[PDB]
């Protein structure tokens with residue numbers, strides 16, 4: 001329960017996760033801008049493209065991330081980008097983070113040209129993950145685990161990622177069995193949600209299709225990480 | 230390919 005390799009590992013990750021990266025100036029638009037399907041889409045695009053950068057900076061500061069193959073570093077980023085955004089947005093909605101402006105963020109998502117087919121599942125996820133009543137520590141560790149996934153397609157040296165992920169998985173279990181002796185199945189719950197997170201990759205590809213055919217444009221950065229061809 | 234990401238990683 002909390003060794004010296006782990007107490008220091010965690011603090012490095014929470015120090016990263018807490019590095020207030022998303023500019024207030026930017027996130028403030030969620031609240032202050034006009035509400036309409038076009039403006040809702042534009043604001044969400046700006047959040048996502050900014051968030052990708054925040055993700056890259058947080059990823060970089062992950063232990064032993066920079067010691068990886070360059071081609072694998074990209075496959076992990078492109079592979080986890082969406083799942084990481086769902087985690088951060090989830091935290092917004094569940095933790096009511098001031099910077100996120102939960103209720104208005106929800107207004108914008110619910111009117112940005114996203115089919116009910118995806119809206120329904122999306123917010124179902126949000127509700128269930130909230131019912132986990134996770135801590136910021138958990139939110140941070142889950143994000144780190146998702147980013148460092150050896151399942152990602154096109155990956156070459158999978159075992160090397162597994163080597164960076166395993167330690168993080170263990171620390172998370174430690175925070176589950178220790179802080180939650182009440183129910184040891186808590187760690188299994190978290191992992192369960194991860195599978196659920198994965199489902200949104202397909203949903204997201206279809207959301208992009210629909211936006212695209214309706215003449216919506218994304219940023220160079222998002223076009224690249226999402227392969228918007 | 231994927232130059233923008235390599236640029237952010239090296240930044």
Ligand SMILES: CC(C)c1onc(-c2c(Cl)cccc2Cl)c1COc1ccc(-c2ccc3c(C(=O)O)c[nH]c3c2)cc1
Nearest residue numbers: 022027041044045047048051082085086088089099100109
């Ligand atoms: C390209 C657009 C239109 C898109 O396509 N699919 C999705 C999308 C949707 Cl609609 C739902 C889930 C996942 C994705 Cl990718 C999105 C919107 O993605 C994001 C990304 C990131 C934030 C986000 C992050 C951090 C903070 C934050 C803080 O940290 O202080 C304060 N405010 C924040 C906002 C919101 C929305």
